[PDB]
């Protein structure tokens, strides 16, 4: 499943990914209890992000 970034998001941790609005990621799983998803940018940063920063 593909995901498109709505807003800029700064990494507040080493496992917490960072990106720009417009950039696109791959969902590695479903959310957890809080709203966090496992994702992956292109070659190829892996980290957690908040799901409400993304659309279809």
């Amino acid at each position: 499943v593909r995901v498109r970034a709505l807003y800029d998001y700064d990494g507040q941790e080493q496992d917490e990914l960072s990106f720009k609005a417009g950039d696109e990621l791959t969902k590695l799983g479903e959310e957890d209890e809080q709203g966090w998803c496992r994702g992956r940018l292109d070659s190829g940063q892996l980290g957690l992000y908040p799901a409400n920063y993304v659309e279809a």
Binding site: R4, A5, L6, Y7, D8, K20, A21, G22, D23, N52, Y53
Partner: protein
Amino acid sequence: TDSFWEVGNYKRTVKRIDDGHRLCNDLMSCVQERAKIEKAYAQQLTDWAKRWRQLIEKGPQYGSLERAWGAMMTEADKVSELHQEVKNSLLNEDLEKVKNWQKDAYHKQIMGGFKETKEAEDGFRKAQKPWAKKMKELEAAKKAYHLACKEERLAMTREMNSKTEQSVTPEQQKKLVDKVDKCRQDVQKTQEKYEKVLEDVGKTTPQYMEGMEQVFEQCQQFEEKRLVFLKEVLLDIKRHLNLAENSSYMHVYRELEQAIRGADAQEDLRWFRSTSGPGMPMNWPQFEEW
């Protein structure tokens, strides 16, 4: 520090623009989940009502008590309707209202971001540029100025505990106090440069503060519009959630109390007497031949 006035720290303000859009999504989904909840209750009430009408009517309970008991299913049907209305209002009125406000306040770029977030970046960036460049200039000149101070200092110390010792040969060391001298002139040159930049910074501070304020104030006006509109939407929602805004909800239970108050034991009793009791007809004995 974290002061807004330090280079770069305006991003908190830029960020508040993106946050507003997200909050609209969050609210929309929030009310959306509440409509499911309301819909689910209504449906369950509707099923009970259907279930127990069938179960009651199919005997044996008769008379006005069946009627009084069955008036309850009606109250389940009526409050069910009211909660369906809460759902219809939430979805058709409140959600669409936020939805439309959104598409009009926030316009999107092919890259990714929003026109409006980008417009505050460019304003802040533009307003800070002269300032930022002068700040890099200042720090360098301070470095250069301090570098000289430290050095000339070394040349100093390297003199009292120096000359007085051995080689105080003129043919050599008079050109030595000329090292300390050369430093003197060096600290002066860099000092003057440092003070120059510091004077530049001073005279362009009002413009820096003016320009950053104009943009900040644009941002506050954008947020005020969001806050004023959201307040009106919460009010719309509270009205819709509240089944006591009008008095249809009160009439349901008034209707119900009347139905129960109408039911009479004696009527149910007298009716049994005629259809199943002594009131029934009979062909009493009489003479019978062929």
